[PDB]
């Protein structure tokens, strides 16, 4: 009930009573009126220097409204009827010194139509004087407006829209909202008004449900987030927040050692491969091979990597066609591991925390384990303090980090300042929870992003959350945090559009539990659809990163496209085969060479593979990495099915002579079909027979029927070959 006090405190400031001789009846009447307004919009008004004056008679007769031009003397009531300031009871003055003027009365309780107007004036203060300073209302509110105009019942419009909007043909776009700022603000206010005045609220909910709902959720929840964003722009607020935190960690800081500071700094800027050293620990024979390798000839060395290697040879020459060699690609594979940057946070993201993964040389594995085990000990003090309650921290992120495939079309191709609503809704779809397996580095007060960062997180730390303080106003958080996504919306900031993500920190065990129960649910369901034994572990969720929930909700959808595009009898025979060898359908966000289904079956470490998908015969499992973008694959489904092709290529070649488990794609008959039709499909498909078979099997089962035709009229002998194997497997 600190409630009533919050309002008393705030009101004694902004509220000025200046009447004749009833300064207790009138001074108590105002308290009754403003009490209906959300405590938070009053503080936001105080924030921008606004004040409320309760006066008698003609309100024009006040010092604050003298500078009023002989035009702004005529206002419109909530119903759109022209009036005159010297004949009205309220007025909110714009400008850098906001003013609210209210006449005196107590019949505000009785004569509701005036309270309605007074609130409408406040709503105006809210949408025009306050929210405008943080670029609101925006897309979310525009969506309410578009729901109303394009709904069947035109009553919602007849109650909130001025004819200007009523007669507008198309929907209200961001562009419209910019040219008609005054108009939208008006609608906002009216809706705020009806919602706030206890008697008209029913009307609102009766003829404009979406507006009621928006204003309902906004005044009870979302508004304090507005105050939050509003305070974030105040220099002194920003400085005040930073100081309380700097104080809370003052002891922890003064105690840090050169060694501790060395660790935190190394954790902010990775150490690049020092060319020189590479050359040394190389080899007399190897140097010779390196002395000439058209790095470009290979295909597993990114553009960034190839360049580095190029400069490696060109730096050892200072003294005295393109066939793809074997032991040469072996040499280039080894070096790939060797020329990666020392990046602790990157190591955590790739392994999802599983720092013992055989994915890199043992020497480097231990250095990572040592440094991490140490950072974990440094970041022991939690954010919780007596100096502050709820606390928000910020992080600017690149969407490619969550979903490179959607990241491809997030920014509008025409106007780089706009975000594609199409991809936005998709991205937002199943984004319910997130996980952090590395050390998040956030800002105390929000800061401008880098061009490729169109994601602006606003995170509500738990008092329990441990962290470390940095001098530049940032905090390094402890690994293994849990995050519940609370809201995802398009916002405009500094002349550009971003995706604001409102998230709350929770115990990681809470999120893991959801995933685990998902795995149980998804397997129950699919074990029934495939007729597998009740409790078999078929599908598995290896989720550890920031897009966490999507990896899970996505698997369901991928498997649906997988059953509606392939013959049920083929699936069953093939997956029974897989299950027989302990196979697994692994959906993950950690890089593939860290899923055991692949590494516990590797000869050498450098023989690892990372990509959108992968099939491992030795384990009979299919691996699908979520975050990436399959080069020739348009989406996750496709990718999965492509890998199921390799699985079929397996069971088929197995049914030829189980006395030899081999690939039916290795058959002499097929090596010829590839010799001829091997270049009529996808580029990727041309890589080799196993892949060509897989890309072909894929198109044949695409959702795009047109795509099925392409194989049948460009790969005849193949369309038939793949169909023989199907019927083969199906019957045998
Ligand atoms: C730079 C680069 C290098 C690779 N080797 C890639 C491989 C893939 N995918 C696969 O290798 N898939 C896959 C899938 C199934 C496979 N099955 C068998 C029996 C043997 C395989 N080598 C096999 C391979 C995707 C992207 C790649 N990108
Ligand atoms: Zn493949």
PDB file of N, CA and C in Angstrom, residues 308-354:
ATOM      1  N   UNK A 308      43.969 -15.671 -44.265  1.00  0.00           N
ATOM      2  CA  UNK A 308      45.015 -15.854 -43.264  1.00  0.00           C
ATOM      3  C   UNK A 308      46.073 -16.831 -43.757  1.00  0.00           C
ATOM      4  N   UNK A 309      45.635 -17.991 -44.239  1.00  0.00           N
ATOM      5  CA  UNK A 309      46.567 -18.990 -44.744  1.00  0.00           C
ATOM      6  C   UNK A 309      47.368 -18.417 -45.910  1.00  0.00           C
ATOM      7  N   UNK A 310      46.690 -17.744 -46.838  1.00  0.00           N
ATOM      8  CA  UNK A 310      47.373 -17.140 -47.983  1.00  0.00           C
ATOM      9  C   UNK A 310      48.594 -16.342 -47.527  1.00  0.00           C
ATOM     10  N   UNK A 311      48.396 -15.471 -46.542  1.00  0.00           N
ATOM     11  CA  UNK A 311      49.477 -14.638 -46.023  1.00  0.00           C
ATOM     12  C   UNK A 311      50.532 -15.448 -45.266  1.00  0.00           C
ATOM     13  N   UNK A 312      50.229 -16.716 -45.001  1.00  0.00           N
ATOM     14  CA  UNK A 312      51.157 -17.594 -44.295  1.00  0.00           C
ATOM     15  C   UNK A 312      52.259 -18.074 -45.230  1.00  0.00           C
ATOM     16  N   UNK A 313      51.877 -18.434 -46.453  1.00  0.00           N
ATOM     17  CA  UNK A 313      52.831 -18.903 -47.456  1.00  0.00           C
ATOM     18  C   UNK A 313      53.631 -17.720 -48.006  1.00  0.00           C
ATOM     19  N   UNK A 314      52.913 -16.655 -48.352  1.00  0.00           N
ATOM     20  CA  UNK A 314      53.507 -15.439 -48.899  1.00  0.00           C
ATOM     21  C   UNK A 314      54.508 -14.805 -47.932  1.00  0.00           C
ATOM     22  N   UNK A 315      54.570 -15.327 -46.713  1.00  0.00           N
ATOM     23  CA  UNK A 315      55.481 -14.791 -45.709  1.00  0.00           C
ATOM     24  C   UNK A 315      56.648 -15.727 -45.404  1.00  0.00           C
ATOM     25  N   UNK A 316      56.769 -16.803 -46.176  1.00  0.00           N
ATOM     26  CA  UNK A 316      57.852 -17.758 -45.969  1.00  0.00           C
ATOM     27  C   UNK A 316      58.661 -17.944 -47.255  1.00  0.00           C
ATOM     28  N   UNK A 317      58.260 -17.230 -48.309  1.00  0.00           N
ATOM     29  CA  UNK A 317      58.927 -17.306 -49.612  1.00  0.00           C
ATOM     30  C   UNK A 317      60.145 -16.388 -49.724  1.00  0.00           C
ATOM     31  N   UNK A 318      60.311 -15.519 -48.734  1.00  0.00           N
ATOM     32  CA  UNK A 318      61.401 -14.547 -48.698  1.00  0.00           C
ATOM     33  C   UNK A 318      62.828 -15.085 -48.512  1.00  0.00           C
ATOM     34  N   UNK A 319      63.154 -16.237 -49.093  1.00  0.00           N
ATOM     35  CA  UNK A 319      64.506 -16.772 -48.928  1.00  0.00           C
ATOM     36  C   UNK A 319      64.892 -17.894 -49.899  1.00  0.00           C
ATOM     37  N   UNK A 320      66.116 -17.800 -50.423  1.00  0.00           N
ATOM     38  CA  UNK A 320      66.695 -18.768 -51.359  1.00  0.00           C
ATOM     39  C   UNK A 320      65.680 -19.561 -52.176  1.00  0.00           C
ATOM     40  N   UNK A 321      44.847 -25.498 -63.795  1.00  0.00           N
ATOM     41  CA  UNK A 321      43.960 -26.360 -63.022  1.00  0.00           C
ATOM     42  C   UNK A 321      44.285 -26.282 -61.534  1.00  0.00           C
ATOM     43  N   UNK A 322      43.452 -26.921 -60.717  1.00  0.00           N
ATOM     44  CA  UNK A 322      43.644 -26.929 -59.270  1.00  0.00           C
ATOM     45  C   UNK A 322      43.191 -28.243 -58.623  1.00  0.00           C
ATOM     46  N   UNK A 323      43.934 -29.339 -58.871  1.00  0.00           N
ATOM     47  CA  UNK A 323      43.624 -30.664 -58.321  1.00  0.00           C
ATOM     48  C   UNK A 323      43.429 -30.643 -56.804  1.00  0.00           C
ATOM     49  N   UNK A 324      42.398 -31.334 -56.322  1.00  0.00           N
ATOM     50  CA  UNK A 324      42.122 -31.387 -54.889  1.00  0.00           C
ATOM     51  C   UNK A 324      42.864 -32.553 -54.239  1.00  0.00           C
ATOM     52  N   UNK A 325      44.086 -32.288 -53.781  1.00  0.00           N
ATOM     53  CA  UNK A 325      44.924 -33.305 -53.149  1.00  0.00           C
ATOM     54  C   UNK A 325      44.343 -33.864 -51.853  1.00  0.00           C
ATOM     55  N   UNK A 326      44.741 -35.087 -51.515  1.00  0.00           N
ATOM     56  CA  UNK A 326      44.268 -35.739 -50.298  1.00  0.00           C
ATOM     57  C   UNK A 326      44.991 -35.214 -49.068  1.00  0.00           C
ATOM     58  N   UNK A 327      46.183 -35.739 -48.804  1.00  0.00           N
ATOM     59  CA  UNK A 327      46.952 -35.314 -47.640  1.00  0.00           C
ATOM     60  C   UNK A 327      47.126 -33.800 -47.525  1.00  0.00           C
ATOM     61  N   UNK A 328      46.737 -33.067 -48.566  1.00  0.00           N
ATOM     62  CA  UNK A 328      46.825 -31.615 -48.528  1.00  0.00           C
ATOM     63  C   UNK A 328      45.603 -31.067 -47.790  1.00  0.00           C
ATOM     64  N   UNK A 329      44.419 -31.598 -48.098  1.00  0.00           N
ATOM     65  CA  UNK A 329      43.205 -31.145 -47.425  1.00  0.00           C
ATOM     66  C   UNK A 329      43.289 -31.584 -45.963  1.00  0.00           C
ATOM     67  N   UNK A 330      44.095 -32.611 -45.709  1.00  0.00           N
ATOM     68  CA  UNK A 330      44.292 -33.132 -44.361  1.00  0.00           C
ATOM     69  C   UNK A 330      45.130 -32.118 -43.613  1.00  0.00           C
ATOM     70  N   UNK A 331      46.116 -31.576 -44.318  1.00  0.00           N
ATOM     71  CA  UNK A 331      47.012 -30.580 -43.761  1.00  0.00           C
ATOM     72  C   UNK A 331      46.247 -29.294 -43.487  1.00  0.00           C
ATOM     73  N   UNK A 332      45.359 -28.928 -44.406  1.00  0.00           N
ATOM     74  CA  UNK A 332      44.578 -27.712 -44.248  1.00  0.00           C
ATOM     75  C   UNK A 332      43.531 -27.860 -43.156  1.00  0.00           C
ATOM     76  N   UNK A 333      43.117 -29.095 -42.892  1.00  0.00           N
ATOM     77  CA  UNK A 333      42.135 -29.341 -41.845  1.00  0.00           C
ATOM     78  C   UNK A 333      42.797 -29.108 -40.496  1.00  0.00           C
ATOM     79  N   UNK A 334      43.977 -29.685 -40.317  1.00  0.00           N
ATOM     80  CA  UNK A 334      44.703 -29.521 -39.072  1.00  0.00           C
ATOM     81  C   UNK A 334      44.905 -28.048 -38.744  1.00  0.00           C
ATOM     82  N   UNK A 335      45.268 -27.263 -39.755  1.00  0.00           N
ATOM     83  CA  UNK A 335      45.523 -25.841 -39.563  1.00  0.00           C
ATOM     84  C   UNK A 335      44.287 -25.038 -39.232  1.00  0.00           C
ATOM     85  N   UNK A 336      43.129 -25.515 -39.671  1.00  0.00           N
ATOM     86  CA  UNK A 336      41.894 -24.807 -39.384  1.00  0.00           C
ATOM     87  C   UNK A 336      41.749 -24.704 -37.860  1.00  0.00           C
ATOM     88  N   UNK A 337      42.019 -25.802 -37.154  1.00  0.00           N
ATOM     89  CA  UNK A 337      41.936 -25.819 -35.697  1.00  0.00           C
ATOM     90  C   UNK A 337      42.957 -24.852 -35.133  1.00  0.00           C
ATOM     91  N   UNK A 338      44.154 -24.894 -35.709  1.00  0.00           N
ATOM     92  CA  UNK A 338      45.274 -24.058 -35.287  1.00  0.00           C
ATOM     93  C   UNK A 338      45.135 -22.550 -35.525  1.00  0.00           C
ATOM     94  N   UNK A 339      44.417 -22.137 -36.566  1.00  0.00           N
ATOM     95  CA  UNK A 339      44.275 -20.704 -36.835  1.00  0.00           C
ATOM     96  C   UNK A 339      42.999 -20.038 -36.309  1.00  0.00           C
ATOM     97  N   UNK A 340      42.337 -20.678 -35.355  1.00  0.00           N
ATOM     98  CA  UNK A 340      41.139 -20.101 -34.764  1.00  0.00           C
ATOM     99  C   UNK A 340      41.590 -19.203 -33.616  1.00  0.00           C
ATOM    100  N   UNK A 341      40.875 -18.097 -33.376  1.00  0.00           N
ATOM    101  CA  UNK A 341      41.185 -17.138 -32.305  1.00  0.00           C
ATOM    102  C   UNK A 341      40.902 -17.711 -30.915  1.00  0.00           C
ATOM    103  N   UNK A 342      41.646 -17.268 -29.909  1.00  0.00           N
ATOM    104  CA  UNK A 342      41.383 -17.752 -28.559  1.00  0.00           C
ATOM    105  C   UNK A 342      40.229 -16.892 -28.100  1.00  0.00           C
ATOM    106  N   UNK A 343      39.035 -17.482 -28.057  1.00  0.00           N
ATOM    107  CA  UNK A 343      37.819 -16.762 -27.680  1.00  0.00           C
ATOM    108  C   UNK A 343      37.019 -17.562 -26.646  1.00  0.00           C
ATOM    109  N   UNK A 344      37.250 -17.268 -25.370  1.00  0.00           N
ATOM    110  CA  UNK A 344      36.565 -17.966 -24.279  1.00  0.00           C
ATOM    111  C   UNK A 344      35.049 -17.990 -24.445  1.00  0.00           C
ATOM    112  N   UNK A 345      34.438 -16.823 -24.649  1.00  0.00           N
ATOM    113  CA  UNK A 345      32.988 -16.770 -24.802  1.00  0.00           C
ATOM    114  C   UNK A 345      32.538 -17.582 -25.996  1.00  0.00           C
ATOM    115  N   UNK A 346      33.302 -17.511 -27.084  1.00  0.00           N
ATOM    116  CA  UNK A 346      32.973 -18.264 -28.292  1.00  0.00           C
ATOM    117  C   UNK A 346      33.052 -19.774 -28.018  1.00  0.00           C
ATOM    118  N   UNK A 347      34.019 -20.167 -27.196  1.00  0.00           N
ATOM    119  CA  UNK A 347      34.180 -21.566 -26.856  1.00  0.00           C
ATOM    120  C   UNK A 347      32.952 -22.045 -26.096  1.00  0.00           C
ATOM    121  N   UNK A 348      32.413 -21.208 -25.212  1.00  0.00           N
ATOM    122  CA  UNK A 348      31.236 -21.611 -24.446  1.00  0.00           C
ATOM    123  C   UNK A 348      30.012 -21.743 -25.338  1.00  0.00           C
ATOM    124  N   UNK A 349      29.833 -20.788 -26.246  1.00  0.00           N
ATOM    125  CA  UNK A 349      28.681 -20.832 -27.139  1.00  0.00           C
ATOM    126  C   UNK A 349      28.666 -22.077 -28.036  1.00  0.00           C
ATOM    127  N   UNK A 350      29.834 -22.419 -28.585  1.00  0.00           N
ATOM    128  CA  UNK A 350      29.967 -23.567 -29.467  1.00  0.00           C
ATOM    129  C   UNK A 350      29.684 -24.902 -28.775  1.00  0.00           C
ATOM    130  N   UNK A 351      30.119 -25.021 -27.526  1.00  0.00           N
ATOM    131  CA  UNK A 351      29.938 -26.243 -26.755  1.00  0.00           C
ATOM    132  C   UNK A 351      28.737 -26.231 -25.814  1.00  0.00           C
ATOM    133  N   UNK A 352      28.040 -25.103 -25.737  1.00  0.00           N
ATOM    134  CA  UNK A 352      26.886 -25.013 -24.857  1.00  0.00           C
ATOM    135  C   UNK A 352      27.261 -25.228 -23.401  1.00  0.00           C
ATOM    136  N   UNK A 353      28.537 -25.042 -23.083  1.00  0.00           N
ATOM    137  CA  UNK A 353      28.994 -25.232 -21.725  1.00  0.00           C
ATOM    138  C   UNK A 353      29.770 -26.525 -21.536  1.00  0.00           C
ATOM    139  N   UNK A 354      29.583 -27.462 -22.454  1.00  0.00           N
ATOM    140  CA  UNK A 354      30.273 -28.747 -22.394  1.00  0.00           C
ATOM    141  C   UNK A 354      31.744 -28.519 -22.771  1.00  0.00           C
TER     142      UNK A 354
END
